[PDB]
Each structure stands twice: as structure tokens, then as C-alpha cells.
Amino acid sequence: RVFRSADVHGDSFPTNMAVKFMGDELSKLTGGKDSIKVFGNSALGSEKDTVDQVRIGAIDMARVNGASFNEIVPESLIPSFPFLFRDVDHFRKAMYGPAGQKILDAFAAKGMIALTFYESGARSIYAKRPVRTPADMKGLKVRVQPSDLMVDEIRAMGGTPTPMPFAEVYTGLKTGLVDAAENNLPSYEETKHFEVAPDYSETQHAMTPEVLVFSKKIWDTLSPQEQAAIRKAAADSVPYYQKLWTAREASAQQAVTKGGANILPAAQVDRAAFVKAMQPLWTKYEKTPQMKQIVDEIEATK
Ligand SMILES: [Cl-]
Ligand SMILES: [Cl-]
């Protein structure tokens, strides 16, 4: 069969490519038969829309950002904690290890098989002015993802958060509904947010992963062999994604700078002030002993 999968990005974006790559792998490991069609550009709805559809089995899979599960899977809050990961190497070692698996395992109770994470860089503020310190955030109308944690993060930074679907952000910035948002560089480039919010300040406040989920209702009708093939194709798509993503982070920086954007480097930003303001949120979002244990396991990963 053709499995249907959702994504907010366009057809050439690394996430879409990775899942399409996964699709090609599946079609060999099943011999021509099975495949994945990726519906890009939010065609199937917002990330939250598409998560709900996966849960009820209206669609087979979605590639979405970790924050899109924050009201559903408590463990998904964790990798979105502000300043949790020290760097890319830490993210990788922690998330592709036993602690990341515990997070993935948590989705099953909520009607989803979480197949894999993909890295998503670090998210940073961008606006019509630069931002070095929480004082600079005051008065900015900052779009965030529809997540209570992300709302609180931007408030803790000093901005006024406003939840909006990914697809609507470019227009929101144009019309002045919002004058700021936050994301990684490749997203900053792809959506052309850089043309309306040309000041990118590397606050690097979160490193939320992408998660690839499969409908448990559909999953449970498959054989163990088919299930294993699907897990295998997913795992194999990660190194492929990594090659594209590593390159895209670098090229996106070049592209946006050539197009007028000004990146304020991480060292220029008062990380300590942001960390102090945001750190209380960990305790706020540790809902269970199980969550505490995972956070501590991640912190302990060196
Ligand atoms: Cl969205
Ligand atoms: Cl987003």
C-alpha cells in the first residue's frame, strides 16, 4: 500500500526528503509494493491537525515538531526544555540513546508509534530588531507554536507570545499581527521570514527534535515483519537526513545574509540572563517521577 504522510515544509525541505527517502527504502524492502506519499506545505492541516488525524487513523503518518505533542504526550515536553542540550553532540548522544527511547516509548499510550527523531538545530528569536537580553524582548509580539511550554518560554524571555500554525507565520509578520517568531535557520530561510524579520538573534533557547509518528491503529493491523521493515526504513533515513541538515544549516545562513538578514552570534547574546529566567520552567513541566528521571538521564549524558 501507499502510506500517507504529512509535513508543513515544502517538497525539497530536508524532512520531506528524508521521509521520501524512507519511502524508497520501504519499496525495495517490500519489493515495489509499499510506498510513502508525503503531503507537504500543510496540505493536510496544521501539525496539531495532522497529529489528531494520525491518532484516529485518518492518515498513516506525520513528520511533526516535538512541541506539537506537548498537550498530548507529557514526555514530549522534555526535549523542548529551554537550554537542556549543551550542543549538537549532546542532543545526538542523548536522543539516539536509552533516554530518547523512553520518550519514543511514551507515544504508544496515546495512539502513536514514534518511529524516530530528527534533529532540528537550535531555535532562536528573529524580529525587526536584534535581541541580546530579556529587556530587548519587552513589547515584541512573538509567534510561538501552539504549546503551553513554548508560550511560557517566550514569556519567560520577556516577549508577548501568540500561537499560530506554521503556515500562517509569514503572513502574520507581513500584516503586523506579529513582529517576531523563533526557529532554526533553514526554516527561517524556507518560509522567507527573513525578508520581514531580518534580525536573527542566536538565543538558541531550545533544540526541540522533529518526531516521526505512525498511527497505532493502522500499525496494529500490520505483521511484525512489516512493522520491522518500517522501523528499519525510518532508522536508515536518519543519516541521510543528517547529511542534508548539516549542509542546510550552513547554506541557509549564507542565503539569508545575502538576502539582507543580520545574524547576531550566540556569544553576543546574554545567555546567562535567558537561562536564569527560563530554568524555573523545568520544574514547572516535570509532571511525573518518570519525567524527572528522563530529564536527569539527559543531563547526565556527557
Ligand atoms: Cl503548524
Ligand atoms: Cl514552528
Curated annotation (Swiss-Prot):
Keyword match Transcription regulation: no
One GO MF term attached to the UniProt entry: carbohydrate binding
Pfam hit, one: DctP
CDD domains, sorted: PBP2_TRAP_SBP_like_3 (cd13671)
Residues bound to beta-D-galacturonate: 9, 47, 63, 123, 183, 210
One cellular component (GO) term of this entry: outer membrane-bounded periplasmic space
UniProt keyword list: Periplasm, Signal, Sugar transport, Transport
Predominant place of localization: periplasm
GO BP term, pick one: transmembrane transport
Residues given in the record as beta-D-glucuronate binding sites: 9, 47, 63, 123, 183, 210
Stated family: Belongs to the bacterial solute-binding protein 7 family.
Stated role: Solute-binding protein that binds D-galacturonate and D-glucuronate (in vitro). Probably part of a tripartite ATP-independent periplasmic (TRAP) transport system that mediates solute transport into the cytoplasm.
Quaternary structure annotation from Swiss-Prot or TrEMBL: The complex is comprised of an extracytoplasmic solute-binding protein and a heteromeric permease formed by two transmembrane proteins.
Protein name in the entry: Solute-binding protein Bamb_6123
Native organism: Burkholderia ambifaria (strain ATCC BAA-244 / DSM 16087 / CCUG 44356 / LMG 19182 / AMMD) (Burkholderia cepacia (strain AMMD))
